[PDB]
Structures are given as C-alpha cells and as structure tokens.
C-alpha cells in the first residue's frame, strides 16, 4: 500500500573491509597541531605497515583554502589523504555546526581539487554513528561530515575516498583495518569499525498504541511549507491547542488565512513570532503555555535558509543557513528536557539520508537532527528524526531542481500520505524513519551515474 512503500531506515550490516591491501606512494595524514597524536601514530604505523610513505599535514583551525592549496602543490604525487580533523576534537561552547572539522574538511577538499592532487580523501570520525541502539552518538554535529561527504562524493568522485567511524579514543580498530579500507577492495565508502568487526551503511525497507495530539503542540516553521501541512494534520487529529512559531509569526505570508484554516479544521491556534536560535526567546515562549494545555509534542519543521546564491560551500555559510534548524533543535531539546513530551519530531531530509548534487548546504543540518534524535533516545528521551522525501502541494520551488528530483525518481508525496507515514512511525516509536517515494528503476541509475555505491545493496527493488 501507499504508506508502506514510503518506509526505510538506515542499518549497519557486517561487511568485508577488502582483502589484504598493499599501498604505494605517499599518504598524507591531515590533523590539527594540538589534537589526535595517538590516532595519527596508529594511522601512520598502519599505513607504513602496508607499504606507504606517510607524512603529517598539519592544518590550521579554520584555515584559508588557498594557502592550503599552495602547500598541497609542493608535496608532489600524493596517493591519498587521511583526515583526523574530527578525531580527538574539542567541544567548546558554540552552535553545533560552528565545528572547525566541518569547515576544514570542506577547505581541505577544495584545496585538493585546486591543487589537482588526483587522490581520494578519507575522513575518520569518533563514535559519530551508532551501529545499533546499544551505541551512543557522541557528538551529533560530526554526522554533518557524513551528510556533506556523501554529496561531495556525488559531485566530485575522485576527491572523496570515504568515511570511517571508530570508537572514540581507541586506535585498535583503525590499526587493524585501515589499510584494507583505503585499498578499497569492496566498494565500501561508509564504514563503522567496531571491536567485533566492520560494518557498512545500508538502506533497508521498514515493515494497539496510537499517538494523539494533546495539550499544546508546537510547530516551528509552522506558518508555511511542510510545517503548515503538519499544522493542518494536527488540527484534523484534534490538537487541543496549536502553537505555530516562525521568525515573522503572525506577519508571515498567509498566516492569518492559515489560522482561519486551522480554526475551521477544529484547532484553536496561537501564532508567535520567535527566533528559535535565541534560547532565551524560546524559554519565554514555553513559559507562557498554560497549565491545562501543557506542551506535549514538538514538531520542529524550521527549514534551512537559502538566499539563492551559488558560492563554494563553506562551513561558515552552512552554519548560518542551518542555524534555525540546528540551534533551534538544540534549544528545544535543552528546554523540553524535563517535560513529559509524547513526541519530539525533527524534520530531516533525504539530503542527509543519501544526498544529491546541489544539496551540500542542506545535508549537514539534517544529519545533525538524525544524530540528536539518536542521542536523545540513548538518554531516555523521546525523539523522532524523519528524513523526508519531497512533498506535494505546500512549499518547494517549481523549477529545474525540483523537476530534476522527479526526473531522478523521487516523487512528491501527498501531504495526507506523508502524515500517515509519520503517524505509523510515531506509533512504532521509530527513531530515524525515512519516508520517501522512490522509483528505484530510475533513481539507481541517476545515483550511480558517476560513482558506484553499496548503500542500496539490501533493497530488492534496487537489484
């Protein structure tokens, strides 16, 4: 039926690193001067042991991609770069995507392209993924490296080797497997190294209790687009009180009509102007909720900004574009930590679930949501991060990009059907449901036009 065919999830399956290995040429180990010395040492020894020359490439925090490109042209014929920028990485107080390793991963990639190095980059992360619910995502921002890395792989295959997660603070798994991983036997580019073995990222189809809105339900990005559709769905399900939040609030385009629409569907509705990146403003808002309709659910549909500019991706612009999504999510997480929420739903995207050319500015913030929901569930808190495909009707510019997705086999979902998928995901307490209409015959050939993948090996329709 319609709903069941929309449903997927990310799993981690046992897989082979590749056989043996044996490397030639020089490998650079990119790192910050302060951090990751132990892992760099194990990495060097593991690469040397397979037969490679290994040299350190000390990167400055938030460096310029042009002085770095100059440096890379002098070192001469490099066979690969191993990045530890995200290993042993400090967590100083800042917004989650201010992360230097994100900014420097992008500059490193760009400097490798500018300098015509001709060699792949491999990025190591530490507990950034969970192969199962018994593992905790350590820093949800490190998933942004995976989100954008999958886009970079689709835009410039030659420069992206892949992504490798290891347990935080351990080197034995990296030492054991690194050589076979970068020798690239089995076409794996999204790997988790664990004490018990090697795991590859995989898409999988996902086959009494009934969630209902109660008290006050909060929708960010609630005055338009997908959030407005969510508002309508909640009203039909009888939400006692809807609280819609956006930057403009009751001055947003269509807001007055939306409120009248929701009132006629049954829901008493408050609209508030609120900048959800401002923790204190959000705190004031939540404190104005009455005792008889306490906050019972959050639906965080604040979208990523797009100014319509096509510069080179920078960590700085990504952090700004996605702050409502990212900082809003973390603010709401911190401020509802002690409420008895029935649902805390983060609106993520296919941009992080598998990525696409042009979506590099969107995947990092949605990847962060994916990790924040898993972290919350590890910590005993309710959370759902829905990776949406495209929606029909409300929102989304028509032109060459959205036509391109449909051409590539991602079909817009009727709002009614997507919300039914969300209902089922909530009733089953899924942490990271993927909800998307894919025509696999078309999609796979578009997705692998320039680069093979194993990400879809477990989907029957894919073979």
């Amino acid at each position, epitope marked *: 039926d319609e709903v069941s065919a929309l449903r997927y999830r990310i799993e981690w399956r046992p897989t082979g690193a590749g056989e043996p290995a044996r490397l030639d040429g020089t490998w650079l180990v990119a790192k910050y001067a302060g951090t990751a010395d132990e892992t760099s040492t194990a990495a060097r020894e593991a690469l040397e042991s397979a037969g490679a020359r290994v040299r350190e490439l000390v990167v400055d925090a938030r460096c310029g991609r042009d002085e770095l490109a100059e440096r890379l042209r002098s070192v001469g014929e490099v066979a690969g770069v191993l990045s530890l920028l995200a290993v042993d990485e400090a967590e100083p107080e800042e917004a989650p995507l201010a992360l230097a390793s994100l900014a420097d991963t992008l500059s490193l990639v760009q400097a490798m392209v500018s300098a015509e190095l001709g060699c792949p980059l491999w990025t190591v992360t530490e507990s950034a993924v969970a192969t199962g619910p018994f593992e905790r995502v350590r820093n949800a921002a490190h998933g942004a490296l995976w989100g954008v890395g999958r886009v970079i792989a689709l835009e410039n295959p030659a420069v992206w080797g892949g992504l490798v997660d290891v347990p935080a603070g351990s080197v034995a798994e990296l030492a054991r497997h690194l050589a076979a991983v970068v020798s690239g036997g089995a076409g794996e580019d999204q790997l988790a190294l664990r004490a018990d073995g090697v795991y590859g990222r995989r898409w999988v189809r996902a086959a009494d209790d009934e969630w209902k809105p109660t008290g006050t339900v909060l929708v960010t990005g609630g005055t338009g687009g997908v959030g407005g559709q969510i508002a309508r769905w909640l009203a039909r399900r009888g939400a006692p009180h809807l609280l819609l939040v956006s930057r403009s609030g009751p001055d947003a385009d269509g807001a007055g009509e939306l409120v009248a629409e929701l009132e006629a569907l049954g829901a008493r509705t408050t609209v508030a102007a609120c900048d959800v990146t401002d923790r204190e403003s959000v705190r004031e808002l*939540l404190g104005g909720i009455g005792d008889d309709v306490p906050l019972s659910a959050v639906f965080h549909a604040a979208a990523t900004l797009d100014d319509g500019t096509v510069d080179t991706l920078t960590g700085e612009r990504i952090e700004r574009a996605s702050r409502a999504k990212v900082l809003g999510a973390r603010n709401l997480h911190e401020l509802t930590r002690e409420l008895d929420l029935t649902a805390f739903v983060l609106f993520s995207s296919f941009a992080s679930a598998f990525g696409a050319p042009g979506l590099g500015g969107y995947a990092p913030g949605n990847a962060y949501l994916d990790g924040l929901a898993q972290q919350r569930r590890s910590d005993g808190l309710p959370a759902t991060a829905v990776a949406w495909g495209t929606w029909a009707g409300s929102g989304m510019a028509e032109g060459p990009v959205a036509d391109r997705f449909r051409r590539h086999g991602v079909i817009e979902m009727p709002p009614e059907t997507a919300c039914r998928a969300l209902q089922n995901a909530l009733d089953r307490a899924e942490v990271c449901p993927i909800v998307i209409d894919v025509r696999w015959d078309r999609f796979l050939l578009a997705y692998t036009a320039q680069r093979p993948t194993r990400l879809f090996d477990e989907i029957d329709d894919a073979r």
Partner: antibody
Amino acid sequence: EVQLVQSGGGVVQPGRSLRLSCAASGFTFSSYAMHWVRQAPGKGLEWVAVISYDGSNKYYADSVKGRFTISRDNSKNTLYLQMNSLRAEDTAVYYCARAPIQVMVRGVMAPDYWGQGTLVTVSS
Amino acid sequence: VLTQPSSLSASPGASASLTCTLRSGINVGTYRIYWYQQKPGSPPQYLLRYKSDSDKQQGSGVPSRFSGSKDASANAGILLISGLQSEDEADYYCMTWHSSAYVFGTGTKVTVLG
C-alpha cells in the same frame, strides 16, 4: 489599581442556591482568566473553579462538579459563581481571583491577584 | 495530592525551606508549583511559581529572598525564604494543576522563633 469587588454572600438554607458576583476594575477584564477559591474558617485554601478569558473553557473541582456553574459577563466586567444544592461543607469565605493576562489563544494559569472574599454560611 | 508540613519555625535571618510533596506515583518534575502567602485577615498573596530552572517566575513586587526550586529525591517543591524576617510569619500554600483542576497543598504556618 486592580480591584475585585465582591457581592452576594450571607446565609443560605441547606439544599438551596446562591449566586456570588465579582465586579472587576482597573484592568481589561476580558483578557484574564478568573478563578474562584474558598476557605472554610480556620481551614485551608480549596480551589473551586476557573473560567478562561473568553469564557469558552471552564474547569471545576470534583467537590463542586455538577452543583456549581462559573460564568462571566465580559460586557459588564463581572464574574459569577452560581452555587446549588449547598450543604454545610460549603460554608466558607469565597474569593474571586484573577489569573495573569492571557498570552495564547488557549490556556489558563493560577491566580496572581485575589479579592477580599465573601462569607457564605449554609444554615437553617 | 499536595502535602505540606503544618508548621515550620526558624530564627530571624535563617533560610526556611517549605516543602510541597506530591503523591508517590506522580513525578514532581513536570508540575508548575505556585506559592501563596496568607496573613491574618488578608487575602492570599501570590509569591512565585516554579516548574524547573527553565520555567519559573517571581511574583510582581515579591522580594527575591523568596525563591523556588524542587527536590527530586523528596518528590517535592520547595519555597525558600532567605533572610527570614518577622514580617514573614503567615500561612503558606502551594498550588498546582493536576488532572482537570487546580489543587492546593494543606498549608504551612511559619513562626519566627525567638
């Protein structure tokens, strides 16, 4: 200044009815939920009922549910408590009390300002 | 539903901790506790409310030596009167929403010793 001027106390026979009123001034009456609270002499505070700023929501304590009706007249800046089937247990000072000003289209909060009270005595 | 000690005494200047304990089987964490002071022959006066460090508010005009918090161990809300003065002798009531009604605690009388 905020004022809640209460009327309508006195003696009432067991089983009969009594209507309390509270005339509000010094604030925009229709922007505030309104509570009734009672206190039997020498005893503790007992919440009775609340009505939302626009009158569309009402809640009552179990001990009065089905006997009392709370209501308001936003064109007369007046709050009412209609009390029926009164017993000796209902003898108390009855306080009008104002919630803080309404922020959202729905929701009530506990009082931030109280009236002086009126004694209702249920007696033969 | 809401249990308070009938009496509490402390000498001037001390820090009096008034407790408002919820029934077991119900977590104090999510409840917004309102506090009222009532002096002889006067209507109650609103002091403050506390749900958590995220969600709390001081009543208009109420001196800041009155503060709120919670003791999760004791499943109880706390009203703290720092710098207890003789003026603070009074009955103190906590109040919170539960089910479809507001409910008051049983009340605590505060005597200033000495």
